[PDB]
Design a protein around this ligand. Sequence first.
Ligand SMILES: CC(C)C(=O)Nc1nnn(C)n1
Length: 165
Amino acid sequence: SFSGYLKLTDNVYIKNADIVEEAKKVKPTVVVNAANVYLKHGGGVAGALNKATNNAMQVESDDYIATNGPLKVGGSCVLSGHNLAKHCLHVVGPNVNKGEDIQLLKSAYENFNQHEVLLAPLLSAGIFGADPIHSLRVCVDTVRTNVYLAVFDKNLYDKLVSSFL
Ligand SMILES: CC(C)C(=O)Nc1nnn(C)n1
């Protein structure tokens, strides 16, 4: 199962890891994607997860959007995990760089509660523009299921652990 994680709370764990590499190693039941409403997996975690699936995630996602329309900011959908996981939970955190309401970050993390265990990135962090320290705080105060957080950046990982209240 998951190895090398630092335990933050009863149910939240954290590791300085590449979530693609982590997913290929563990093959978790659920890998969380830092998705946008259109499921256009261009950059950040989404671009990296999609590239690891050889674009199969994007092909599946375009069919999902053609049938269902876009997700809501704060919403999610469950699609295939391809070669990374059994399932991919595509969760849309607010993109602060698009002027989206940061208050939707709690709604976004609530989607994790539908899954007993997940491998995930910090929602709205990275290219989504939110403060990752705030994202981790909302994660630990919202998610009640077992979440294994993969933080790519070592310097950010150290800052998150050292500042964790
Ligand atoms: C109270 C408001 C800001 C809120 O949480 N709205 C919401 N959360 N997820 N979706 C979708 N819509």
